[PDB]
Design a protein around this ligand. Structure first.
Ligand code: HEM
Ligand code: HEM
Ligand code: 6NI
Ligand code: 6NI
Ligand code: NA
Ligand code: ZN
Lengths: 400, 400
């Protein structure tokens, strides 16, 4: 009943006993594995389980306080169909959700998370203020700090609060007449939506998009982040002098804003969170994916590489230097960043810590292993077990 | 019912209808995914299914010959508890087994497999002759040809033919008294077994191991491969002149010899197959894996790289050049080899062919994506479905 998990580099063996307690069910079946794919009484059950987790965490399970809390939750759900989380529970819940995220390699930092309680938010304007304060705190002038802001939970009698943008800071993507895209191709849809809602666009490759914020049962409202709040880093290479001339740059703060936070059966459709970048996401994914900025060929040509044949590994060489530039640039600008070697090494420690703590750790191998130099990192040689635990961060349909 | 499979680079969508027809079951459940883990009547149902597959392949399903064959097989099983394959079925079966291997990126060449029928093999000595013949045919002085030699099947009241070695060509691994290992650490166990059975061990880093061949109900017999039959490639770099001095080398023929070929319920414990190398297996895994030759640091030092900090990406830079050396060296020696870019590109074509041919393709994402520069290849951005189809190549316990 317990999956044997082996590490092929050292040969060590462990058994995931935590998986046996996975809340929901994934896409896999004994007939076929779908691991590579990206995407009343029920409420009470989840609520009771979460409360049990909370009291267990503070070493007070089975106490009068524990029993009282369970009774209160039941009473509220019986009377309103929902319930109110206590401040301390929201904090605990948010940390667990990050802890439970199978695709996150930076989980060793799970317990260090600043939680901003915005459950009293009433308007899009107030949403904006909350978001600006989050960005300010999180950016901390380069010494990034992990944070999450939680807006009002989904209610049975009203619409949801939603942040239309996928991240708080993203670059516009403008479709050109010739069929090409200026800016980030991943952001074409949201870019066009902003324009449709009244935003006169820029014409650059790195235009910070306005926020399209939605209050319950109301059309989304446009808000522009003060430039002074958006910390960016100009990209240069330590030896390749011409690299800085490409005019490339990236933002400091990776802040996912389109996921749903689930705590004890309660759902928070708007709960943006942020940490700091692992260099490969910028250097490899954002800059080199064929469907993103796709700068590989241009960089290789500037590096005087032989792009005539694949065997020269011109692509690999260019990607490595682009990653070097990202690391060099962030360190120079004094903006928090972590390379894939340091990040994966820290995750191995996280796995060890979690084995002792809960007897396992939900991890998605395809996402944990970096987009470049996979086998050069320890996680590549580590077998993993992927499963769903709650509290959790979940994907949800776009509000439009 | 039919899993939706998406390519994230192009946005194309397909449905794997083939998976719903997968015979055997895998390790995954809706509770948890174990996709990253490395490891009479029943016979008749498997036999009938395979016979049906064969007749469908020659467009004669439902014919008198088809029915007569099904009846013939049923009669044989009732009279002996097993049955024999016709040569044409054996050839078809072997090809399907390769076609069905989820972890193989070279499947576009599946139809070109040359199948050698060695079911008439009478002894370990004859087994050796067959193996040497295979090596000669397959190597072809550098112009590699894919092939498989099928030895007698497993049958009741008789032992099995077995090749103890994991591959026909492997380098010895000598555990030094100081804890280290001279040669390939992955081959320590097999090296020590060869020694026990009377082999006089060498002391080099690249000593070609002898073959430990087992005939039914007989102890394994030692056989030395004539040096002239084992084609090897000395490794050098196109610009780094000192690389050649490292004395690195690798063999031309990758020939897996410890897997079990399963066809229509029948099992062939000894059926060695071979193709040609994808450069990353040698350059990245064999030479750079921590638990293998682990030459990364030494090469980085010779390259004058700053090995003090991980953020300089010295590991990545060294790995790329080692891979360049491999490609350059095999091309210079005129020995067939394929880089990861060309291999993955060909696999995308194979997926397209298979979608039209069978409505799907069992593929293990974790194994298909190369150990370096994953996202730089098209397969990384392609969702895959992993399932078991028969005929198939399966892992089996070591004979000892
Ligand atoms: C402290 C620095 C952090 C690092 C280095 C880190 C790194 C990563 C990486 C590399 C990914 C995969 C690529 C991607 O999804 O774009 C990821 C995914 C994820 N991370 Fe973390 N992370 C950090 C902080 C956080 C925080 C603060 C939270 C939440 C409180 C979090 C929640 C998640 C979630 C939910 C995902 C999955 C996103 C998805 O499925 O698209 N991470 N993280
Ligand atoms: C012709 C060129 C070929 C190429 C470039 C190729 C490449 C690969 C690669 C890269 C792997 C990954 C396994 C590893 O990491 O060692 C693999 C696995 C595999 N290949 Fe192919 N292959 C070829 C031919 C063949 C042939 C001729 C067969 C069978 C008739 C075959 C059967 C398999 C099987 C069964 C596996 C799984 C082995 C394991 O998991 O240990 N391959 N191949
Ligand atoms: O805070 N996050 O969930 C998050 C998401 C993606 C990346 C990439 N580098 N760092 C990250 C942090
Ligand atoms: O013969 N094979 O199945 C096989 C196994 C691993 C590799 C790596 N490059 N080529 C290969 C062929
Ligand atoms: Na990003
Ligand atoms: Zn799975």
């Amino acid at each position: 009943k317990f999956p044997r998990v082996k590490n092929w580099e050292v040969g060590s063996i462990t058994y995931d006993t935590l998986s046996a307690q996975a809340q929901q069910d994934g896409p896999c079946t004994p007939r076929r594995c779908l691991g590579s794919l990206v995407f009343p009484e029920q409420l009470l059950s989840q609520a009771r389980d979460f409360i049990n987790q909370y009291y267990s965490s503070i070493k007070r399970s089975g106490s009068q306080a524990h029993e009282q809390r369970l009774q209160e939750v039941e009473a509220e759900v019986a009377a309103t169909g929902t319930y109110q989380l206590r401040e301390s529970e929201l904090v605990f819940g948010a940390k667990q959700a990050w802890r439970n995220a199978p695709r996150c390699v930076g989980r060793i930092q799970w317990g260090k998370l600043q939680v901003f309680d915005a459950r009293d938010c009433r308007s899009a304007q107030e949403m904006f203020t909350y978001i600006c304060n989050h960005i300010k705190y999180a950016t901390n002038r380069g010494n990034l700090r992990s944070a999450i802001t939680v807006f009002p939970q989904r209610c049975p009698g009203r619409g949801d609060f939603r942040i239309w943008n996928s991240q708080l800071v993203r670059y516009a993507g403008y479709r050109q007449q010739d069929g090409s895209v200026r800016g980030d191709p991943a952001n074409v849809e949201i870019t066009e939506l902003c324009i449709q809602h009244g935003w006169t666009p820029g014409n650059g490759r790195f235009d910070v998009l306005p926020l399209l914020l939605q209050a319950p049962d109301e059309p989304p409202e446009l808000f522009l982040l003060p430039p002074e709040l958006v910390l960016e880093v100009p990209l240069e290479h330590p030896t390749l002098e011409w690299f800085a001339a490409l005019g490339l740059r990236w933002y400091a703060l990776p802040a996912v804003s389109n996921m749903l936070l689930e705590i004890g059966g309660l759902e928070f459709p708007a709960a943006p969170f942020s940490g700091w970048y692992m260099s490969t996401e910028i250097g490899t994914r954002n800059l080199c994916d064929p469907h993103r900025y796709n700068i590989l060929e241009d960089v290789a040509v500037c590096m005087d590489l032989d792009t005539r044949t694949t065997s020269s590994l011109w692509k690999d060489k260019a990607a490595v230097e682009i990653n070097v530039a990202v690391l060099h640039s962030y360190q120079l600008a004094k903006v928090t960043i972590v390379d894939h070697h340091a990040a994966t090494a820290s995750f191995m420690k996280h796995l060890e810590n979690e084995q002792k703590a809960r007897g396992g750790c939900p991890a998605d191998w395809a996402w944990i292993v970096p987009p470049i130099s996979g086998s050069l990192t320890p996680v590549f040689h580590q077998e993993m077990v992927n499963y769903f635990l709650s509290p959790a961060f979940r994907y949800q349909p776009d509000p439009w």
